[PDB]
Amino acid sequence: TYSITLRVFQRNPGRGFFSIVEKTVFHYANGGTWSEAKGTHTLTMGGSGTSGVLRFMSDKGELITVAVGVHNYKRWCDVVTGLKPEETALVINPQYYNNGPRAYTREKQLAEYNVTSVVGTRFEVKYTVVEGNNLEANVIFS
Amino acid sequence: TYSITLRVFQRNPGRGFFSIVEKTVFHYANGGTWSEAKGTHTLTMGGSGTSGVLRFMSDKGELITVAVGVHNYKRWCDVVTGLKPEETALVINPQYYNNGPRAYTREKQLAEYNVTSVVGTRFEVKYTVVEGNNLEANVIFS
Amino acid sequence: TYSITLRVFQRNPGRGFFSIVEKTVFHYANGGTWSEAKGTHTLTMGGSGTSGVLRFMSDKGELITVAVGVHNYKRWCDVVTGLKPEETALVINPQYYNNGPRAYTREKQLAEYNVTSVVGTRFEVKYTVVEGNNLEANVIFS
Amino acid sequence: TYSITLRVFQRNPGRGFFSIVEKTVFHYANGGTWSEAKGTHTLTMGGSGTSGVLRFMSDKGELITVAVGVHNYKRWCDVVTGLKPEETALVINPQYYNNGPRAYTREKQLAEYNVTSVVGTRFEVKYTVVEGNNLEANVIFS
C-alpha cells in the first residue's frame, strides 16, 4: 500500500480563503480512501498506479484541483486552475488515465509542481518526503 | 440553486464506526460543492439535475456510498453497500446517469430509502425537509 | 503519556443532532491536547492525573459535557447535562479538581457512565479498552 | 449576540504546520460556542463581555494561543506564544479577567495584534470586519 499525506498552507488573505469541496479516488490499484488527522489529509491507496483529487473553492469563488498519486512506484502531482463550476473533481480525476488530456502530468512523476491561475493565485505542491510508501507533501496557496 | 444538508447518525457500535473517505459531485446543472458546518454536510448544486456521493468506511472495513441529488425539481437518494475497494465514489456517482445501472434509483425520486448490507449493517437516508430548494435529510447507520 | 480516543454515536434523530462547541484540557500531568482523526477524537495527556472535556450542543439547543481522563493510572469519565449557556466547559472541567463539586466522580475511576438529561436525552460513555496507556471509549447519545 | 469568524492562514512550512488542540469559551455574557464551517472557525457569544481561546500546536511541538472576544461592544484579541505543555487554553483564557496578568490586553480592544515567538514564529490577528455584531478576522502564522 501507498499513502500520501498533505499539509495545506494558505499564504495570502488577498487571494481569498480556500476550503475543500470535493475529494475523489481513482479505481486502479484496488482504489483508496481519503482521511483527515491533525488538520492534514491523507490519501491511502491499495498499491502503485492510482491517485486522488482534492477540489478547493475560495470564498472569492475560485475553483482549483490538486491531484496526487503514485505512478510506477514514484509519486506524482498536478494542479489545475481556472475551473468552471461544471468541471468537478469527478470530471478531472479520470482525465489522468485512459489516454486522457492530463495523463502527461502523471507521467512526469513530479515531486514538485507550481502554477499561477489566470486570475493571479499561485499554487504549489511540494513533496517533502519523495521516496517510499509513506509520502508527504505541502500544498501551498498564494 | 439547490442544497441538500445531511446529518449523520450512527446507532450501533457493534457495526463499527464509519467515517467519510470520499465526496464527489456530478457535472450536470453547473456542478456543485460539498461543505461542512456544525458537524453536518451540505451539497450545494447549480440547479436541478445533478447529485453527489459520500463514501464511508467503517473501522471494520465496510464500504458504503450515500447518493443524494435533485431530479426534475424533486429530491432523490440511494445507498449502495457491500462495495469492493476499487468501487470508489468516482465510479459510483456517474452510474446514476447516461443510462447507467443506478439511474433507476434517481428516477424514483425517493424522500426515504433504507437497505441492509449483506454483512448486516442497516443504512437509511430520510429527508426531513422534502420540498423546496433547501433540502434536509438524516443519514442513519445501524 | 496516556491517550483516550472517543467515537461518537448518535442514535436518535428526535433528540436533535449534537456537535462539539468546546474542548478543554486540564493543566495537571503536563497538560495535553485534543486531536481529530478519521472522525474520532483523541485526548493525549503528558501522564496520569489530568483530563479534558468536550462540550456538545444539539441543534435543538441542549448543552451537555463529556469528561474523560486518567486518575492514578485508571481511566475516569462523567457526563453533565442540563447545562446553562454560561456553564461552559471552561467552568466545568476545573470542578473535577480542588474540592470542586464534581471531584467525587473523578475519584470513582469509572470505565462506564450513563445518565439521562431532564429534557430526556440519554448519554453514555463506555470504555472499550479499559487498561493501559492507549484507552478507547464510545460516547453514545440516545 | 456577537460572533467572531476566523480564517487561519499559514504562510511558512518551515515553521511547521499548526493544528487546533483546544477551544475554550469564557463564562460571561451568557457564554458562547465554537463552530466550524467551510474551514473557518466561529465563536458565537450571548452578548458583549466574553471571549474564547484557540490553542494551536505545530507538528514541531510549538504551542501558542489566540484569544478573541468583545469587551464593552468592541472586539479584542491577543496572542500568547512560548507556552509550556501545562499552560493549556483552560489556564490562559481566565487570565484575561479578574486581575489576571493578561487583563490589560482585553482592555485595549485591539482590531489587530502581532507578535513573534522566541523560537521565531510570527503570529498576527487582523480583524477584516471591525464593527458590528458579526466580526471577522484573519489569523496568520508566519
Ligand SMILES: CC(=O)N[C@@H]1[C@@H](O)[C@@H](O)[C@@H](CO)O[C@@H]1O
Ligand atoms: C504499477 C503501476 O503503477 N502501474 C500503473 C497502472 O496501475 C496504471 O495506473 C497505468 C496507467 O497508465 O500506469 C501504470 O502502469
Ligand SMILES: CC(=O)N[C@@H]1[C@@H](O)[C@@H](O)[C@@H](CO)O[C@@H]1O
Ligand atoms: C431539470 C432537471 O432536473 N433535468 C435533469 C437533467 O439535468 C439530467 O440530470 C437528466 C438525466 O436523465 O435528468 C433531468 O432531465
Ligand SMILES: CC(=O)N[C@@H]1[C@@H](O)[C@@H](O)[C@@H](CO)O[C@@H]1O
Ligand atoms: C498519578 C496521578 O494520577 N496523579 C494525580 C495528580 O496528577 C492530580 O490529578 C491529583 C489531583 O488531586 O490527583 C492524582 O494524584
Ligand SMILES: CC(=O)N[C@@H]1[C@@H](O)[C@@H](O)[C@@H](CO)O[C@@H]1O
Ligand atoms: C458589556 C460588556 O462587555 N461587559 C463586560 C462584562 O461582561 C465583563 O466581561 C466585564 C469583566 O471585567 O467587562 C465588561 O464590563
Ligand SMILES: CC(=O)N[C@@H]1[C@@H](O)[C@H](O)[C@@H](CO)O[C@@H]1O
Ligand atoms: C493554468 C493551469 O491551471 N494550467 C493547468 C496545468 O497546471 C495542468 O498541469 C494542466 C494539466 O492538467 O492543465 C492546465 O494546463
Ligand SMILES: CC(=O)N[C@@H]1[C@@H](O)[C@H](O)[C@@H](CO)O[C@@H]1O
Ligand atoms: C444491498 C445493496 O447495497 N443494494 C444496492 C441498492 O441499495 C441500490 O439501490 C442499488 C442501486 O444503486 O445497488 C444495490 O442493489
Ligand SMILES: CC(=O)N[C@@H]1[C@@H](O)[C@H](O)[C@@H](CO)O[C@@H]1O
Ligand atoms: C442529570 C445530570 O446530568 N446529572 C449529572 C451527573 O451525571 C454528574 O455525575 C454529576 C457530577 O458531575 O452532576 C450532574 O448533576
Ligand SMILES: CC(=O)N[C@@H]1[C@@H](O)[C@H](O)[C@@H](CO)O[C@@H]1O
Ligand atoms: C512573546 C509573547 O508571546 N508575548 C506575549 C504577548 O503577545 C501577550 O500580549 C502577553 C499578554 O498575554 O503575554 C505574552 O508574553
